[PDB]
């Protein structure tokens, strides 16, 4: 299975100055639940913004840099390389990779952040006419999670 995994706001913002614009532990927990034991594929800028591979899953970084060789990270140099990765593969970001892969993936796990943030990077436009809502779950608001958010699982029609 090839999936997108993304959190975006009401205007599809996903980032600002190499960081996530919001702070939502519930979503981090969901990312961990979905991707532990599987594979994350991310562009070079997303990886660098994270800074280190995420524990307990395969980390794959897409880059043109032939010198890239980070411990605990597998490197690929082409989009076509993604299709040779075994198991459940999640396209993890950022804008460039989402743009390159949204027409190719089987399904999408999208956390919709119900707010409008300042952003400089965006998820590409998509239409529910192309995507079935397999599930939609409202996130719980509390002390640590204070922006409304909804977990979607969308499957390509």
Annotated binding site for substrate: 5-6, 27, 49, 57, 92
Report the greatest alpha carbon distance in the chain.
45
95 binds, among ligand NAP, ligand U06, none (CB under 5 to 8 A by kind): ligand NAP
Half-sphere exposure for 50 (CA within 13 Å, toward CB) = 19
Closest distance to ligand U06 from the beta carbon of 14 (Å): 8
User: According to the binding rule CB under 6 A, does residue 43 interact with ligand NAP?
Assistant: yes
Applying CB under 6 A, among 93, 112, 113, 123 the residue interacting with ligand U06 is 93
Number of CB atoms found within 10 A of residue 39's CB: 20
Q: What is the distance between the alpha carbons of residues 80 and 89, in angstroms, rounded to a whole number?
A: 13
SS3 content of the chain, % helix, strand, coil (to 5): 20, 35, 45
Stretch that binds ligand U06, among 20-28, 69-77, 99-107, 131-139 (CB under 6 A): 20-28
Q: Which two tokens stand for residue 47?
A: 């990886």
Closest distance to ligand NAP from the beta carbon of 44 (Å): 4
Q: In this complex, which beta carbon is closest to ligand NAP, that of residue 60 or of residue 62? A: 62
User: According to the binding rule CB under 6 A, does residue 32 interact with ligand U06?
Assistant: yes
């Amino acid at each position: 299975t090839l999936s997108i995994l993304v959190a975006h706001d009401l205007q599809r913002v996903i980032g600002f100055e190499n960081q996530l614009p919001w702070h939502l532990p519930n979503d981090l927990k969901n990312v961990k639940k979905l991707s532990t034991g599987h594979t994350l594929v991310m562009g070079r800028k997303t990886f660098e913004s994270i800074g280190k591979p995420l524990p307990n899953r395969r980390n794959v970084v897409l880059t043109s840099d032939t010198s890239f060789n980070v411990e605990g990270v597998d490197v690929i140099h082409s989009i076509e390389d993604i299709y040779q990765l075994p198991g459940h593969v999640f396209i993890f970001g950022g804008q460039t990779l989402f743009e390159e892969m949204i027409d190719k993936v089987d399904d999408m796990y999208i956390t919709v952040i119900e707010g409008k943030f300042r952003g400089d990077t965006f998820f590409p436009p998509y239409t529910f006419e192309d995507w079935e809502v397999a599930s939609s779950v409202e996130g719980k608001l509390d002390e640590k999670n204070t922006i409304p958010h909804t977990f979607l699982h969308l499957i390509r029609k």
